Design a protein around this ligand. Sequence first.
Ligand SMILES: Nc1ncnc2c1ncn2[C@@H]1O[C@H](COP(=O)(O)OP(=O)(O)NP(=O)(O)O)[C@@H](O)[C@H]1O
Ligand SMILES: Nc1ncnc2c1ncn2[C@@H]1O[C@H](COP(=O)(O)OP(=O)(O)NP(=O)(O)O)[C@@H](O)[C@H]1O
Ligand SMILES: [K+]
Ligand SMILES: [K+]
Ligand SMILES: [Mn+2]
Ligand SMILES: [Mn+2]
Ligand SMILES: [Mn+2]
Ligand SMILES: [Mn+2]
Lengths: 321, 321
Amino acid sequence: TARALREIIRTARETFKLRKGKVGEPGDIGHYAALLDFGNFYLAMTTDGVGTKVLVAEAVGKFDTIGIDMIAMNVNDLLCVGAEPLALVDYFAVKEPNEEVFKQVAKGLYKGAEEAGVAIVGGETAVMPDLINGYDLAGTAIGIVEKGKVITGERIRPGDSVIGISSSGIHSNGLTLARKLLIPKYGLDYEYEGRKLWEWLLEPTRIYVRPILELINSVEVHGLAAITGGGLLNLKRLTNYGFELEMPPIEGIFKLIHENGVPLDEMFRVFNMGVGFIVVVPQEEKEEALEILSRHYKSYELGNVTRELGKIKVKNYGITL
Amino acid sequence: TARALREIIRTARETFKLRKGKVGEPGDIGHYAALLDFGNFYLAMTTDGVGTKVLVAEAVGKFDTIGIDMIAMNVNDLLCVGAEPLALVDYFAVKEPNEEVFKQVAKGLYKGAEEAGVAIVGGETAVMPDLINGYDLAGTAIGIVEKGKVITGERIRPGDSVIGISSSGIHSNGLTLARKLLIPKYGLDYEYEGRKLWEWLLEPTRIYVRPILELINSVEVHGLAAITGGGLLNLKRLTNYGFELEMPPIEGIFKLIHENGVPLDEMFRVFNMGVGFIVVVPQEEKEEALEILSRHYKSYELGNVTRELGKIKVKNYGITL
Ligand SMILES: Nc1ncnc2c1ncn2[C@@H]1O[C@H](COP(=O)(O)OP(=O)(O)NP(=O)(O)O)[C@@H](O)[C@H]1O
Ligand SMILES: Nc1ncnc2c1ncn2[C@@H]1O[C@H](COP(=O)(O)OP(=O)(O)NP(=O)(O)O)[C@@H](O)[C@H]1O
Ligand SMILES: [K+]
Ligand SMILES: [K+]
Ligand SMILES: [Mn+2]
Ligand SMILES: [Mn+2]
Ligand SMILES: [Mn+2]
Ligand SMILES: [Mn+2]
């Protein structure tokens, strides 16, 4: 995967010079979004799909929230460079132009867009039954951040406070592993802690736009990280410094997954494990930050930045990533 | 397909108010790209995938042109509102991370981006074998257009000259019909007019950024249309006025398709039939427009706009769409 992707990454970096010194000149690839120089401001650009979670939605005929996942994936990435999300286009590659599915998808697209404060301004619909075994939903979002107000993690210093905002659940990463491990063993209707397995797998991703925009307009912020592919390893994209964390207890779907063989170190590398978004602020602003975030979502002090470069220590679990 | 899409379109229109009176306020859905009000200028945004052409690519192992198809699909759409393409992200949804496939894909991505003058600033790579029976490659492009320089077709009037720029071949629409009709009977190694069928089907989509940007900066232009899904029906997106046209002779892959039982009136609603891009100019600019475009690609005077609303007459073929 990394060897295959490197070919595209290297080609992409080569094309940067086509906009050198011109409107749209990019920064480097690697962060949660691209930053494009528009003179007075940066434009942020990101793209992501929902993933195989759509296979669960199709099974129970509930696409009412897949659109929330898609918008969440994209606007939460815009936040991680300090950008205010503005607009989105959706790429909907489907096996069939089913009017019932499309009606369900539209409902969540509105709900997500409302929560994020963005307009859905266009898109593409590709009926490709030979290529698509379901209803793949992806999107591309753009946002804006003023020059001088970009947050990429370069300000992170040892001793900074690390705060986690709770997730709504599995969100949109690790779905294939969870599906193949749990569905054939327990059945989609398996009731676990009052919710069916498909209810655990379909829980829409949380949208962090409002608490994070409030936070960056109120306190000093040194880093912002959506916990997606790679789980806690996403923190290393922000800085070479280390992290000393205490993660919340494993429960819900994550407990179920863990009890079915998956080791905890792999799980902190795959699932958000209850923390959907992480902010890094100076210790001076920790209490103020907790209060702003905790108005909107249950939020924790996870730990501190350390000088153990490149290491993430989950102390209460005896794990280093 | 139209009724299913109506659900998302109406919902996306409802989200416009979330950006009303703000940076990024959108125009209406329906055109080749969306236009977002950034004050001194509009930002153009569009997204599109390659389509089932990637299935032919996988069948024969030739992947170094679908990356051109993806970039062409998106930058040619930005041209159709008068915008200069700036930047693109790509969405690569794959059954597996085959390093050979990704190396080929990156070659075409570089060639396309260099021809269009865009930087590939980021992207997404998603391995989902349960969902994707191949290598689905899509993208999202961003462009810029000044206030008062947008070209939508609103200025098209009866009498206007209609000019077509030759396509390189099938481009990226109608591939599903072409696949199911030709591949079982002939196979991808069948030679037609000195070229293998896979050479016909994988010829990369032409990029029109250079001739079109030169054109709108030189003469008055009333309409621009990439000839994609629905073939010549795309002209009806620019205006309700009619068209009287003389289309090029049916040659190459289109003749082979026609001769295998596809009627001519269906082919003009599916394939570009040799015309990849159409521009509408006032008669007084016709010669100068032909001159600029002929410096880049073979270009034709196709005909004129008429007062026979809602119809496209292909006179030399006796067809009315
Ligand atoms: N196919 C691609 N083409 C170009 N850039 C890509 C591609 N895939 C990934 N990238 C870039 O590589 C970096 C890492 O990508 P990715 O791992 O998708 O980040 P993410 O979106 O934060 N994680 P996730 O939401 O789990 O996919 C980003 O800056 C992307 O822009
Ligand atoms: N899933 C979608 N969500 C939102 N808008 C959409 C969606 N699909 C299509 N649209 C919009 O509907 C209009 C027509 O779409 P489309 O038929 O894809 O245009 P095109 O890209 O010019 N043609 P093609 O290249 O053949 O796909 C555009 O303005 C799109 O932005
Ligand atoms: K991203
Ligand atoms: K488009
Ligand atoms: Mn992401
Ligand atoms: Mn399209
Ligand atoms: Mn298109
Ligand atoms: Mn991604």
